[PDB]
Design a binder for this molecule. Structure first.
Ligand SMILES: CC(=O)N[C@H]1[C@@H](OP(=O)(O)OP(=O)(O)OC[C@H]2O[C@@H](n3ccc(=O)[nH]c3=O)[C@H](O)[C@@H]2O)O[C@H](CO)[C@@H](O)[C@@H]1O[C@H](C)C(=O)N[C@@H](C)C(=O)O
Length: 431
């Protein structure tokens, strides 16, 4: 889509809002942004060129917009947004922007509780088949931070909020795991209004994975030829053995998790991966190794009042930004950055590195550019080990050593997992 020369206004300066701001700036469009909160988390992350209004909405800005991008945290029913809509001003959310740009199929997942687990599993099933997969959305990493012409499949966890502002989603496979009322303050007209939001996920979906045990997850107008279902004792995928299309496929003894819940999660996940075209071989393997939703970070050592945190999986700028958001650091943050990154996306990261309590240790191929984000507090070495031996004598009680590289590790390691193990070993010897 073209946004050149449009008056764009973004509502919400949280993770989503910031991703949108960067999305637009990276296309030569300077948006105006607002948030009803006086000091939203992304306020100090904006470039000075961006006009901002916080503490309330600025209605003149909204009414003068060509496009309004509304974060999930504000309701379309808000009088300011209702007014803009009546005047015919287009309103979209980050997921909508994402769908317009995506060049790979999308598996979409929504429902209430357990959403993240099913999303994560589908992601693993894709990893097992060797698919460069991008997992994001409501699960944590804003969808727009995943855009990459290298990505071969996207797995998105979506909230009813994101769904209300999305119109161009055409999922290869979509599901509403269940419909259980939550966030009802955002749906004052009842369960039907609430159900309607989730149902949007099936619009133009190639295959709709439905919950045989929850009739509300069926698209309105009964189930069609696109619908495949999962359930405990009923459905295309059901239950011990996992039954699929009438044929047993796996004895639950082969998977690490147990319990009904963990089984229907595995079934819903398989139904989605089958629909997305992933080989059942690899999907089943993933089901047999899956040990659940991983922790956000791996604490490799906590000694002398210092925490050494491994987030080697943050292979891009958006992930590192996500790791830094709301990060509690009692003393100084010794941030490790480096490897093979996407230089085109480095500039915005500098805005997350301000303050008197942050030190950068940059290494690898793009270490020089990374260190250049804020030279005054950065050290530059060739390897991560050198960088760590550098910081070791410098840490004091209360500090945090964080490996959240913002780059891939292929220039010096076999994979980010190995880079993380290296970090674990070195932290134990040095901390
Ligand atoms: C509220 C919400 O939808 N949160 C999701 C959102 O995070 P983000 O930080 O971008 O949220 P936001 O839209 O800025 O809203 C955050 C908070 O500020 C408030 N808000 C937002 C804009 C504004 O003008 N005024 C205001 O008061 C919202 O009411 C909310 O209290 O985008 C992220 C990336 O997609 C999601 O991971 C994140 O999910 C969290 C984990 C969540 O609680 N989501 C709900 C929906 C859920 O899963 O139950």
């Amino acid at each position: 889509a073209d946004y050149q020369g449009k008056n764009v206004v973004i509502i919400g300066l949280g993770l989503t809002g910031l991703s949108c701001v960067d999305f637009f700036l990276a296309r030569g469009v300077t948006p105006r942004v607002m948030d009803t909160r006086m000091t939203p988390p992304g306020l100090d992350k904006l470039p000075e060129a961006v006009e901002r209004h916080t503490g309330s909405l600025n209605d003149e800005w909204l009414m003068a917009a060509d496009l309004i991008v509304a974060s999930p945290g504000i309701a379309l029913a808000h009088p300011s947004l209702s007014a803009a809509a009546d005047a015919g001003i287009e309103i979209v959310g980050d997921i909508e922007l994402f769908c317009r740009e995506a060049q790979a199929p999308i598996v979409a997942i929504t429902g209430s509780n357990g959403k993240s687990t099913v999303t994560t599993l589908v992601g693993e099933m894709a990893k097992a088949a060797g698919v460069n997969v991008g997992v994001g959305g409501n699960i944590g990493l804003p969808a727009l931070m995943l855009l990459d012409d290298e990505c071969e499949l996207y797995v998105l966890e979506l909230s009813s909020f994101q769904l209300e502002t999305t119109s161009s989603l055409q999922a290869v496979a979509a599901t509403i795991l269940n419909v259980t009322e939550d966030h009802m303050d955002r749906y004052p007209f009842g369960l039907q209004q609430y159900r309607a939001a989730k149902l949007r996920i099936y619009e133009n979906a190639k295959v709709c994975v439905v919950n045989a045990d929850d009739a509300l997850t069926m698209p309105i107008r009964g189930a069609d030829e696109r619908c495949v279902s999962f359930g405990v004792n009923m459905g295309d995928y059901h239950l011990t053995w996992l039954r699929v299309k009438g044929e047993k496929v796996l004895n639950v003894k082969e998977m690490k998790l147990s319990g009904q819940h963990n089984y229907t999660n595995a079934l819903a996940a398989l139904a989605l991966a089958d629909a997305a075209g992933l080989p059942r071989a690899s999907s089943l393997k993933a089901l047999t190794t899956f040990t659940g939703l991983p922790h956000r970070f791996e604490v490799v050592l906590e000694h002398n009042g210092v925490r050494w945190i491994n987030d080697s999986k943050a292979t891009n700028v958006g992930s590192t930004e996500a790791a830094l958001n709301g990060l509690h650091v009692d003393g100084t943050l010794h941030l490790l950055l480096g490897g093979d990154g996407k230089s085109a996306d480095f500039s915005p990261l500098a805005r997350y590195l301000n303050g008197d309590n942050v030190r950068l240790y940059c290494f690898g191929r793009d270490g020089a550019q990374l260190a250049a984000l804020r030279p005054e507090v950065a050290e530059q070495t060739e390897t991560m080990e050198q960088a760590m031996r550098l910081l070791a004598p410098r840490v004091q009680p209360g500090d945090m050593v964080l490996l959240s590289p913002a780059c891939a590790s292929l220039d010096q390691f076999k994979n980010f997992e190995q880079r993380g193990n290296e970090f674990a070993r070195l932290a134990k010897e040095l901390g």
